[PDB]
From a paper:
Kainate receptors (KARs) are L-glutamate-gated ion channels that regulate synaptic transmission and modulate neuronal circuits. Each subunit has a modular three-layer design with an amino terminal domain (ATD), ligand binding domain (LBD), and transmembrane domain (TMD) which forms part of a common pore. GluK4 and GluK5 cannot form functional channels on their own and are obliged to co-assemble with GluK1, GluK2, or GluK3. Here, we report structures of the GluK2/GluK5 heteromer (GluK2/K5), proposed to be the major KAR in the brain, in resting (apo), antagonist-bound (6-cyano-7-nitroquinoxaline-2,3-dione [CNQX]), and agonist-bound (L-Glu) desensitized states.
We next pursued a desensitized structure of GluK2/K5em to understand how the receptor may reorganize to close the channel in response to the sustained presence of L-Glu. Purified receptor was incubated with 1 mM L-Glu, imaged by cryo-EM, and the structure was solved by single particle analysis with no symmetry applied. The data was processed using a similar approach to that used for the antagonist-bound dataset, and we first resolved the full-length L-Glu-bound receptor to 5.8 Å, then independently resolved the ATD layer (3.8 Å) and LBD-TMD assembly (4.3 Å). The most striking feature of the GluK2/K5em-L-Glu structure is the LBD layer, which shows rupture of both LBD dimer pairs and exhibits an apparent fourfold symmetric subunit arrangement. Although the LBD layer gives the impression of fourfold symmetry, close inspection shows that the G helices of all four LBDs come together in a staggered arrangement to render the layer twofold symmetric. Critically, this arrangement is reminiscent of the ‘desensitization ring’ observed in the desensitized GluK2 homomer structure. Furthermore, close inspection shows GluK5em G helices reside ~3 Å closer to each other across the twofold symmetry plane of the LBD layer, compared to analogous GluK2 subunits in the homomer. The analysis showed that relative to the CNQX-bound structure, the L-Glu-bound GluK5em LBDs (A/C positions) are turned in plane by ~18°, while the GluK2em LBDs (B/D positions) are rotated by ~110°. Meanwhile, for GluK2em (B/D) subunits, the M3-S2 linkers extend ~12 Å further from the membrane in the desensitized state. The desensitized GluK2/K5 structure helps rationalize this functional role for GluK2, suggesting that it is the GluK2 subunits which undergo large conformational changes to facilitate channel closure during desensitization.
Numbering used by the authors:
A (entry chain B): 200 to 248
B (entry chain D): 33 to 397
C (entry chain C): 21 to 399
Write the structure that this text describes.
Amino acid sequence: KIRQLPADTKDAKPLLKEMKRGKEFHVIFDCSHEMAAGILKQALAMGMM
Amino acid sequence: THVLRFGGIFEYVESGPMGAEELAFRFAVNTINRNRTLLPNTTLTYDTQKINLYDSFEASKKACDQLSLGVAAIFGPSHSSSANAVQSICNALGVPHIQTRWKHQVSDNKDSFYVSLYPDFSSLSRAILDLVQFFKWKTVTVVYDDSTGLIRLQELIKAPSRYNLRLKIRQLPADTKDAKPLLKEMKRGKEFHVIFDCSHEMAAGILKQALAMGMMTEYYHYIFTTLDLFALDVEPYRYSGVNMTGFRILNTENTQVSSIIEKWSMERLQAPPKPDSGLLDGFMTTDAALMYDAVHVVSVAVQQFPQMTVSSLQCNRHKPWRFGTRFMSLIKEAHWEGLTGRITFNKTNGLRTDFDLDVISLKEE
Amino acid sequence: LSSLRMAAILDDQTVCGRGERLALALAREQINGIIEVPAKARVEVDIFELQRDSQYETTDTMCQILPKGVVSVLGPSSSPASASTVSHICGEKEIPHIKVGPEETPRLQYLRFASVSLYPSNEDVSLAVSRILKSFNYPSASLICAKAECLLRLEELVRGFLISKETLSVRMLDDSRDPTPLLKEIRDDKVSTIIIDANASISHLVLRKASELGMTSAFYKYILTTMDFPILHLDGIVEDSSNILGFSMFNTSHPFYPEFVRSLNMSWRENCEASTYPGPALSAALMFDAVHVVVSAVRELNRSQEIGVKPLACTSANIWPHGTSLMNYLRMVEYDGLTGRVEFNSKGQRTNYTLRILEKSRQGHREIGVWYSNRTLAM
């Protein structure tokens, strides 16, 4: 299932909330690593880590 | 015209020149003097000493010194051993003692001229019992800091014999703030529901360690007895869905409450906690709040009682205070609607077990 | 100096008591009587009867004691409130407090510690109850605490069990002191072992009420923890079916135990024979043994150094000059005596101590073996 990152921001909280709601547990993230660190902090404070 | 002095025996604080409790006591006497509705013809003077921590002989020396100066009450201290030492000096010498933090009471100890103001952990733990049943928890795990005995959880330990609850008690590493082996045992055991019973400075650390150990998911539900839960900061975990549910005694709905809290905070009186700990600024913690109430409940009883004045009282060579029974009764029968709700005392033991709690919980906001 | 004078504190009464005055005196008589060469410093034991368990009274007594320039302050025997004030005063003054009763204070380790406790530690009895229950294949026990200070005394026992109706549940005595509803709950839930904990008299009351509720039969195992267990004598509560078990540390085989029990037998009837004398309660021995402890360590320090006592006033902070040294010498002392081996760990507790278990019989004791301090339960 393909989901786009927010190109508006790094605040991926809506997207991560859908990812959790849908029980999606395995995610292939393709992003440059600054965005990877941002998404991992916002994944931690979203209880997905 | 009337002078009347209180004593205070407060701890040595490396947080600064004045401890939070001490600042409140100093701020309280001033606030209760500048009010005109209360103690109009009199005033308060306050002789506050400090002690080192765990210094019962020095604390008893201090109490002998203050009572030799002439006091009508001795407030503080906080740590249980120094608390009990001052209690016994006062009980024989007749001068009312008005503690603030929960001490462990010895069940022999027949002493009566003491009144406590922390809401007593028997009834508070009974509240936690009524909460566990509401969430229909069957398995709970109580984690207690060793400094406090399991005695304040005695209703939680008697509780499995009268319901179906599979309690399991574990001890927080007391020497450390880093409880990762404990937390890993808690997770391998799938102990989803935990009743932490620790001071909130420990509770901020435990919650932070939990997030790292990934126990902050939408599974776990952590109930906390620490009545400073609202003053903890929860923005690192608000969206996680961990269902923390704690108790909270401060009447932050009321406007006189929120303006007194504002005065205490915006007067920079407190010492700013750093953002490493995950704790917050500008909050009057429960400890200090009870003290602000304590100066008042005693001062209400003073205002009701015109003719007592202090008298100099040597230790071991002087009689019970000649006004101790009268002043103590009036302190025990005071209904004062303070910052922490109503203040009234279970007249048997001078404790406080009637108090209107607010359960707070972690909603996504 | 010329007399190693030390200070008793006896909470006990002088009439029909644990007789501690007499035991401390007997020990004094035995030591200043055993003539050695060269003629040494004498032993005098100054004795101070304390009325109540109030810290205020104790501070008065200790301020009445420090001028006497005493090497240590024995006791107080059964006053767990007064114990923390003595220990606090003498840890201030650098003078050892040889505690002889338990400690039901929380006893923070960061607290000023210069106290050696001849009384089995609360963790250590807890492990003994844990390991007797591991011998009985972990039945669904239920603990009957007298006060709430049970829970601080048997703390590690509680933590090491999933507290429920099925492994271990705590009941406590109510204010009524009538255990019959509790035993009715215990009989309800099919609770095989009951771990009664109290002082010795509330122990008799739980058992007598239990014997009448018909709960003393073949099925029930009662692991009493009240470490005064040699003085409990039961009539109509003890059957050969009955399985009450206590612990007792007396090394009866030590030569003095027969004679001492004769001396404590004589000075029991004279004060009062209103009840028959139920045997030497434990605190007499721990005091008798402890006077030997402190005399032995002080005597060693009196050799490698020379120790002077100073009129010490609780006002002035003058500290006994040799105190932490005597502490060090106390923590390595070993005396084999009425209370068994007396050796102390670094924490100031007691280790290498033998709690000889007893399972009661229709008249008295059947040593069913020992729970050692280290090599746990070689029964």
